[PDB]
């Protein structure tokens with residue numbers, strides 16, 4: 001891999017130790033600009049205000065609390081995989097799974113599920129229409145009603161929340177929920193398609209995958225990282241990487257996929273090996289390390305198990321399947337088997 005280069009108004013950072021240095025130094029490399037370049041809610045906040053925001057939901061994302069959702073995710077995954085044969089695995093299984101799970105965790109009522117899913121599609125970007133304005137207005141309306149009833153989910157927690165000498169705004173509550181929906185959907189959908197791609201490419205991996213689902217999910221994260229780069233870091237003060245001065249104000253783009261293929265940290269980076277020792281950076285690292293990582297881990301793990309037990313043979317049909325076009329992420333636009 002390359003030392004940091006500057007072009008198109010940003011530094012590009014590729015090496016694993018440099019990606020990590022940047023992400024671990026939140027006070028040197030900030031998460032929001034000096035102004036306007038557009039990330040919502042606490043993802044774009046710096047360390048102090050950010051912790052206040054993240055703590056509101058942090059306890060409910062511990063692998064401990066998340067695990068109470070295991071039977072629900074199994075039930076859901078099974079319902080959708082039952083009868084998927086011959087269909088688009090992305091739109092009929094991989095998109096639908098994370099959106100069901102997240103509505104359960106949020107506390108979206110049963111009777112609001114159809115509209116939540118339409119709104120969710122618009123908002124993560126899976127849909128674009130005239131209907132947007134209408135559907136957003138309809139969903140936000142329901143949202144306000146839910147905030148004032150109660151459940152055990154996040155909506156209810158955001159209702160009873162403040163942090164440090166100040167109540168949460170209603171725009172903050174919506175954006176908070178929006179950040180959960182947007183950061184957990186496409187990424188989980190992309191991972192599911194990327195695990196299917198590993199299987200397609202390494203057909204005798206299957207037995208080992210079954211014996212260590214976690215391990216297989218970890219190596220996919222490393223090897224076909226759903227998120228390829230994070231474009232939004234800005235130097236809060238001058239500092240040096242590989243003897244280059246990164247000046248205050250400079251945008252710093254950090255490449256996770258590329259860092260996850262660094263031969264300095266991974267022996268034989270271009271091979272798929274379950275049970276590697278070093279941590280991958282697919283979920284980032286530091287104070288912004290993925291809030292949904294335990295949930296994502298548990299969803300992928302059940303998805304793998306279910307996909308592996310449903311099909312005998314897994315060949316991707318490349319005359320109908322296509323990779324997404326966006327360079328920032330990695331996944332299938334559509335995926336058809338066999």
Ligand code: HEM
Pocket residue numbers: 042043044054179180181183184185187188191225226227230281282283284285287288289290291292293295296
């Ligand atoms: C396989 C799935 C995922 C991958 C590869 C992924 C990747 C990431 C990365 C790289 C970051 C850090 C961005 C930064 O440092 O600026 C992040 C943050 C975040 N993710 Fe995930 N993510 C995934 C799934 C999920 C899920 C299921 C959720 C649940 C709603 C979720 C919610 C969040 C939130 C709220 C943040 C920001 C945390 C903070 O800024 O403190 N993600 N994710």
